[PDB]
């Protein structure tokens, strides 16, 4: 019975703006696009087109510094190395011109560990490796 593999999520390594960020817990990023649905005058099947693209991302992790608060709305890059060790074919993706949607200055509850949640957008992406 031949083997398989699940890319465990704990293999993620995120380098935000060059420096390796090591408290991040979950990262999401999608490349949206407006469908631009057009109804033809003779054909009864709607047609979709690329339209224009839009990035969106997010990160959650344990707070350890004011890195994001001091960063402000400055543009920055994000790398995401989804390493695979059962098979050594890691995957690396670069997000270009990441900008925060909202600066998370303060978020904390008394009886809990303080976590930092971020969300924003990016102009474009590059698939460095796969």
């Amino acid at each position: 019975i031949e083997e398989a593999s699940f890319l465990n999520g704990s293999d993620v390594v995120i380098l935000i703006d060059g420096v390796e960020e090591l408290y991040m817990e979950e990262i999401k990023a999608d490349f949206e696009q407006d469908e631009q649905s057009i109804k033809l005058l003779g054909c009864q099947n709607e047609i979709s087109r690329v339209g224009t693209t839009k990035g969106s991302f997010s990160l959650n992790g344990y707070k350890t510094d004011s890195k994001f608060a001091k960063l402000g709305f400055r543009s920055f890059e994000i790398i995401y190395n989804l390493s695979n060790s059962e098979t050594l074919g890691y995957e690396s993706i670069r997000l270009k011109n990441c900008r925060l949607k909202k600066l998370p200055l303060i978020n904390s509850k008394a009886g809990e560990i303080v976590k930092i949640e971020v969300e924003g957008s990016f102009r474009g992406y590059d698939l460095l490796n796969e």
Partner: protein, 420 residues
Amino acid sequence: RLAMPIRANWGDVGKVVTIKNDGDDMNYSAFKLGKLALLGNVKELLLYRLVDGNQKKGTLTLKDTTENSAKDVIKLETKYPTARNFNVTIKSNLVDSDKKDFIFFENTKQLFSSSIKGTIDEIVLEINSNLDNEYVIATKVADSDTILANVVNQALEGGNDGCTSITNESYLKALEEFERYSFDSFVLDGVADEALQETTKAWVAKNKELGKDILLFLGGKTEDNIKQINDKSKSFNDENIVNVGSSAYYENIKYTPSEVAVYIAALSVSKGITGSICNAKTIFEEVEPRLSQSEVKECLKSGTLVLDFDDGDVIIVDDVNTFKKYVDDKNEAMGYISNIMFINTINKDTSLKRKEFVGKIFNDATGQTTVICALKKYFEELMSQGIISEFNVDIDTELQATAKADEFYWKWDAVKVDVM
């Protein structure tokens, strides 16, 4: 910012000073060649004075006569050290015996005229602070309220002329002082001695290893024909070094190619990256020796910045450098002074990028990709501004293969807009 080593009696010795849009003698470079530097319309000029070591400040001592025994209460000195006959006439005021008229002279023409009561502080501060006392400093000897004696045309003496002896060590003082400052360009003040030019070549090379690619300008002596000019240009091969070929007239002087280099440097600094002097008009009314197509080609290929009166006004035929005697790996676009200054600006900006990405980033493929992407974005921004037309910045594989853990190498190449 042009570093100007004036051979002048006026100006401060051994110190760097700047002048805004605002010497006088034709023999002194503060006006002879300071005019050349200003005519290129650099945003401001920075000056340095070359003087023989055997040169000091003139000193005049004055004594009172209110009491029978005269004692010194005021001493006057030239603003900068000099032996110039800056004569001073002090006489008792016509109405009040307690006020002394102070008349100062450049040589004999009336410069400043005023009078102050006998208290020494008021007199000295008036003489120091008044507008027409630009050519004197006055200092107190002791607290007094007595009245000076009557003296006419007292010459301040004790020093020596600023043009006493322009020699290699005295010239090198300027470079030694300018080591602590950064400029857009530096120019030799006209003395087309090959020893001085070679010393400046070595100095600029030392700075190039340090990275301070201060754009240098030089020129041949009055006795160099086209052959001598071309040979001396071929002697140099540096990118940032220039050899103006032809003498010129502006008002009265047969300015040497080295002296013309001052105005050429000012124009080059003023133009900046955007402006190129390959076909730009110049202030000069005439330049010699004249050059036909063959002479122009021979001088340009030898590394000479050719100036000719090829039309109704003087025209710089091309903005070329000593590296115009190029070598195969670097194209002829490297041989243009504007391109070299553009390269230096990119080197400075990439040094800013260098200090931005110090060893906090790991020496791995990820960090190298980060730095390369930052440089790529910088060149993309420059292309959007329009200066760059193409670029390819990549890992310097030849140097990076043997790179230790701490060191990383990279390299950039880009095409630039042409101007015929």
